[PDB]
Write a protein that binds this ligand. Structure first.
Ligand SMILES: [Mg+2]
Length: 67
Protein backbone atom coordinates (compact mmCIF):
# COMPACT_ATOMS: atom_id res chain seq x y z
CA UNK A 1 0.00 0.00 0.00
CA UNK A 2 1.31 3.34 -1.21
CA UNK A 3 -0.30 6.75 -0.77
CA UNK A 4 2.44 9.19 -1.73
CA UNK A 5 2.43 11.13 -4.95
CA UNK A 6 5.54 10.72 -7.10
CA UNK A 7 7.34 13.34 -9.15
CA UNK A 8 10.37 12.73 -11.34
CA UNK A 9 13.12 15.21 -12.10
CA UNK A 10 12.80 16.47 -15.68
CA UNK A 11 15.74 18.91 -15.58
CA UNK A 12 19.27 17.52 -15.89
CA UNK A 13 19.92 18.47 -12.24
CA UNK A 14 17.90 19.80 -9.30
CA UNK A 15 19.11 21.37 -6.05
CA UNK A 16 17.30 20.20 -2.91
CA UNK A 17 16.89 23.16 -0.54
CA UNK A 18 16.36 23.43 3.22
CA UNK A 19 13.79 26.21 2.68
CA UNK A 20 11.45 27.11 -0.21
CA UNK A 21 13.99 29.44 -1.81
CA UNK A 22 17.49 29.74 -3.26
CA UNK A 23 18.88 31.57 -0.20
CA UNK A 24 18.89 28.36 1.85
CA UNK A 25 21.30 25.44 2.21
CA UNK A 26 21.56 22.92 -0.62
CA UNK A 27 21.01 19.53 1.07
CA UNK A 28 21.88 17.59 -2.07
CA UNK A 29 21.36 17.38 -5.81
CA UNK A 30 19.06 15.12 -7.76
CA UNK A 31 19.50 14.23 -11.42
CA UNK A 32 17.13 13.63 -14.30
CA UNK A 33 14.76 10.68 -13.78
CA UNK A 34 15.27 10.57 -10.01
CA UNK A 35 12.02 10.63 -8.06
CA UNK A 36 10.67 12.31 -4.99
CA UNK A 37 7.61 11.29 -3.00
CA UNK A 38 5.35 13.87 -1.35
CA UNK A 39 1.93 14.27 0.25
CA UNK A 40 2.04 18.07 0.15
CA UNK A 41 0.56 20.67 -2.18
CA UNK A 42 2.72 22.93 -4.34
CA UNK A 43 2.95 26.44 -2.87
CA UNK A 44 4.24 29.40 -4.89
CA UNK A 45 6.22 27.11 -7.21
CA UNK A 46 7.89 24.97 -4.50
CA UNK A 47 7.12 21.54 -3.09
CA UNK A 48 7.88 20.39 0.46
CA UNK A 49 8.97 16.77 0.94
CA UNK A 50 11.26 14.68 3.13
CA UNK A 51 14.85 14.32 1.92
CA UNK A 52 17.11 12.01 3.93
CA UNK A 53 14.84 12.51 6.95
CA UNK A 54 14.89 16.32 6.67
CA UNK A 55 12.18 18.78 5.69
CA UNK A 56 13.23 19.86 2.21
CA UNK A 57 11.96 21.77 -0.80
CA UNK A 58 12.37 21.81 -4.56
CA UNK A 59 11.46 24.21 -7.34
CA UNK A 60 8.62 22.32 -9.08
CA UNK A 61 9.42 23.67 -12.55
CA UNK A 62 12.29 21.16 -12.47
CA UNK A 63 9.80 18.32 -11.88
CA UNK A 64 7.31 16.35 -13.93
CA UNK A 65 3.61 16.40 -13.33
CA UNK A 66 2.48 14.22 -10.42
CA UNK A 67 2.03 10.46 -10.90
MG1 LIG B 1 10.91 24.47 8.75
Amino acid sequence: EFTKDIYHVTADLLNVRSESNTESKILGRLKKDDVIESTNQVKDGWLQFEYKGKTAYVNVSFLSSKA
